């Protein structure tokens, strides 16, 4: 509910922060071309949770590989806000996704392990 109102209002708050750009700071962009980067995985999470809970049957045992496969090859320049703030999002993704598919297991562990791996180097 209210997380959509405040997420839209924070969206228009960067829309606010985007007016000043004569000789822009990197901090101007990079922290934005990063915070939108996290937000994308956010709204993504909302949408495919709302579907995977209501799909199918048990086809979330079969689909959804999309979101990890979109979550996986996202890159960082140099900022060190990124490789944690993605863990901020992704981790809530593990707890809530795991909490929404419950309303195979060795493949699950290979999948979360294969999550862990690259999220390190």
């Amino acid at each position: 509910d209210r997380a959509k109102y405040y997420i839209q209002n924070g969206i228009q708050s960067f829309m606010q922060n985007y007016s000043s750009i004569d000789v822009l700071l990197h901090q101007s962009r990079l922290t934005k071309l990063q915070s939108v980067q996290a937000l994308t995985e956010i709204q993504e999470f909302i949408s495919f949770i709302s579907k995977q809970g209501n799909l199918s049957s048990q086809v979330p045992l079969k689909r959804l590989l999309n979101t990890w496969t979109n979550r996986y090859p996202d890159a960082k320049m140099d900022p060190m806000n990124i490789w944690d703030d993605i863990i901020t999002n992704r981790c809530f993704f593990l707890s809530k996704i795991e909490e929404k598919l419950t309303p195979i297991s060795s493949l699950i562990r290979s999948c979360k392990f294969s999550m862990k791996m690259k999220m390190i180097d």
Binding site: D22, V23, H26, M77, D78
Partner: protein
């Protein structure tokens, strides 16, 4: 453990980057051999002869790299110890095909020079390498081969020599253009050819003889200028200098010149200065354009230039993916030569790629001692893309193209809206501060220099055995520094805010001016900054950030040479640090210089190699660094030789400076190294003045060899604003402002 790292990389089969283990192994053995060339022993020379001949292949395998460290490897491999008589011949044949054929290129001057003498067995191996790359897509090696080969044909069997001969025959054919454009652009002003030619012959007529074919040939170049401009030798190579000037002057020049032919009388080495001097003040007034612009105005634009592969020269670049991008086309007829050192000439290439490109003409200069320097530049700012904190602030500094054409001339790229803060600062000061009167011709830098002459013995050519008093020094820099320097503080801030309509962009762009500056100043602490006047670092008014173009004086010779005794880390003239606001923020762009520094520091190998073959390689850095500095100005010519009797500036300049990577603080050990010559009590203690009184003795104490992060910087700043070092050094650095 490395043996259990590397060939398993070759046994696995998927991934496990061949480079990731290979190159580390090669750095390991190369540091093994240098550390073993430091000392000789029995187990050290026997094990040392077990360890090194090993890494010599894998630096061919994993060559899909950045590949410049490779170009540094090959001659290193050959000259370093036993140059293999077949091993290298065969797999160093399969390489340039196994690796980008454009790895063939990255070492332009190395290969070409190597072909001749530096390789000895290229004519056996890399001659077939260069002969398979050569006929296809090789227009760029056409240029460099013509410099090196015809210089010295050393000792040969028949095969070695005939081959390179015909290879140079493949650039008279399908490359007949190569020498036709060089014999084209072989210009301009007479004065540099005659004065520089006369220095060149004249400083070899004084000593032992060696005057046989040296002086006999060294007559001929000039006879070309003047015995052929109405003889069949220039009926083939006409010019507009030759049209009239090479004739009006031919009448009188024939007689004095053929009198020179049999002259051969060492005292007349001075006497020429009559004639030359007159012809000098007579050759500055006519260099008035309309000669090479109409004379070059002849372009083919026929048959796609007869399928000509001549790009903007030196456009063949580094890193793989060779696409033969740019194309010659036809030039704009307008030309203008301009007020600078050699009086160099502004060209407008008009590239075919829907774009033009303005280059420069340095006909009186062998642009080589600056080639590997610029390429070493793009290694500077081309390395800073692995440091975070270098990316984080967009910490690179500008490149361009140094175009080393014949042994005698090269060209150089030229951005517009990049201009000499001296010139701009001066005129913009002018339209701002008084009409033109100002003070500059009455009593600031004329009065100050007159005051320095009245404080040593007599004239100005000395004052070096003098330069005493520590209090009066503070009187010179207090007086002139405050008055003078404060003036163009206002004028530089006024130029920035005048050049930023937006009252804010002034303070916006100061950041890129500054950033540029910290970047250039470490760029010089990297190696000597001499001939490098305030007129020699040049600001760009685009992004309002600065770029550094001069390379006469490298490492020591910048600071070391007796005729001009110089020493500072980087041009910290006063008005520049006046323009950074009452900052303070200088003393922490310090941080820029630190992250910069550590960025340099971590990898010794690459930079080490680069600088090694660059100092050792060009005659135009030690064997002709004489030739360089003497070519610039005369006052050097008499002191150098008597200083440089039986003396070699190669491996020590390097060792001192690699040590400068290590932990040499305060410039302190560098200072010493230039000190040891002339003169210990006269100048040495003086450099120790920035090291003496406690306030700045913080420049001396914190010095510790122990791999200190920020130390070298924390001092290196106040190692430049020690007013002593300024007020002393020379008339050019305007330490006034």
């Amino acid at each position: 453990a490395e043996e259990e790292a590397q060939p398993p990389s070759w046994s696995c089969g998927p991934a496990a980057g061949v480079i990731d283990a290979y190159m580390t192994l090669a750095d390991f053995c190369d540091q093994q051999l240098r550390k073993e060339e430091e000392n000789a022993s029995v187990i050290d020379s026997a094990e040392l002869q077990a360890y090194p001949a090993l890494v010599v292949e894998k630096m061919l395998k994993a060559l899909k790299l950045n590949s410049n460290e490779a170009r540094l490897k090959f001659p290193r491999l050959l000259q370093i110890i036993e140059r293999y008589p077949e091993e290298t011949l065969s797999l160093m044949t399969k390489e340039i095909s196994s690796v980008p054929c454009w790895q063939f290129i990255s070492w332009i001057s190395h290969m070409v020079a190597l072909l001749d003498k530096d390789q000895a067995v290229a004519v056996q191996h890399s001659v077939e390498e260069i002969t398979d790359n050569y006929p296809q897509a090789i227009v760029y090696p056409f240029i460099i081969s013509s410099e090196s080969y015809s210089f010295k044909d050393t000792s040969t069997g028949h095969k070695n020599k005939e081959f390179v001969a015909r290879i140079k025959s493949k650039l008279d054919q399908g490359g007949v253009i190569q020498d036709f454009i060089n014999a084209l652009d072989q210009l301009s002003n007479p004065e540099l050819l005659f004065k520089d030619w006369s220095n060149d012959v004249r400083a070899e007529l004084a000593k032992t003889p060696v005057n046989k074919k040296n002086i006999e040939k060294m007559y001929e170049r000039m006879y070309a200028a003047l015995g052929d401009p109405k003889a069949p030798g220039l009926g083939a190579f006409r010019r507009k200098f030759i049209q009239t000037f090479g004739k009006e002057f031919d009448k009188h020049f024939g007689k004095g010149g053929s009198k020179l032919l049999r002259m051969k009388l060492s005292d007349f080495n001075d006497i020429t200065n009559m004639l030359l001097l007159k012809m000098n003040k007579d050759s500055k007034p006519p260099g008035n354009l309309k000669e090479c612009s109409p004379w070059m105005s002849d372009f083919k634009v026929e048959f796609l230039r007869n399928e000509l592969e001549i790009p903007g020269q030196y456009d063949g670049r580094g890193k793989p993916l060779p696409e033969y991008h740019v194309r010659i086309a036809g030039f704009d007829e307008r030309v203008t030569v301009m007020a600078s050192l050699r009086r160099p000439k502004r060209i407008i290439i008009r590239g075919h790629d829907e774009r033009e490109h303005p280059f420069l003409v340095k006909g009186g200069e062998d642009l080589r001692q600056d080639q590997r320097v610029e390429q070493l530049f793009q290694v500077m700012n081309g390395i800073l893309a692995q440091d975070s904190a270098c990316s984080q602030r967009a910490l690179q500094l500008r490149t361009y193209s140094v175009v080393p054409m014949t042994s005698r001339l090269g060209l150089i790229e030229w951005l517009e809206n990049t201009v000499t803060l001296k010139d701009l600062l001066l005129n913009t000061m002018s339209q701002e501060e008084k009409a033109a009167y100002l003070s500059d011709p009455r009593a600031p830098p004329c009065e100050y220099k007159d005051w320095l002459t009245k404080m040593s013995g007599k004239h100005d050519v000395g004052a070096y055995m003098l330069m005493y008093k520590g209090a009066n020094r503070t009187e010179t820099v207090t007086s002139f520094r405050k008055r003078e320097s404060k003036v163009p503080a206002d004028l530089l801030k006024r130029a920035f805010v005048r050049m930023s309509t937006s009252p804010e962009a002034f303070l916006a762009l100061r950041s890129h001016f500054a950033s540029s500056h910290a970047l250039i100043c470490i760029s010089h602490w990297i190696l000597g900054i001499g001939d490098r006047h305030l007129n020699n670092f040049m600001v760009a008014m685009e992004t309002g950030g600065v770029i550094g173009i001069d390379f006469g004086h490298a490492f020591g010779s910048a600071t070391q040479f007796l005729p001009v005794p110089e020493l500072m880390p980087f041009r910290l003239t006063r008005q520049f640090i006046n323009l950074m606001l009452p900052m303070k923020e200088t003393g922490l762009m310090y941080s820029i210089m630190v992250h910069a520094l550590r960025a340099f520091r971590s990898d010794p190998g690459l930079l080490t190699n680069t600088m090694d073959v660059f100092v050792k390689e060009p005659s135009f850095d030690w064997k002709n660094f004489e030739q360089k500095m003497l070519k610039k100005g005369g006052s050097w010519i008499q002191e150098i030789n008597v200083a440089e009797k039986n003396w070699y500036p190669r491996q020590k300049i390097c060792y001192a400076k690699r040590k400068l990577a290590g932990a040499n603080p305060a410039v302190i050990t560098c200072d010493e190294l230039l000190l040891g010559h002339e003169k210990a009590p006269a100048f040495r203690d003086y450099v120790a003045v920035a090291r003496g009184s406690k306030d700045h003795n913080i420049r001396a104490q914190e010095p510790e060899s122990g791999l200190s992060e920020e130390t070298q910087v924390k001092c290196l700043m106040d190692q430049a604003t020690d007013p002593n070092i300024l007020g002393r050094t020379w008339e050019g650095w305007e330490p006034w402002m």
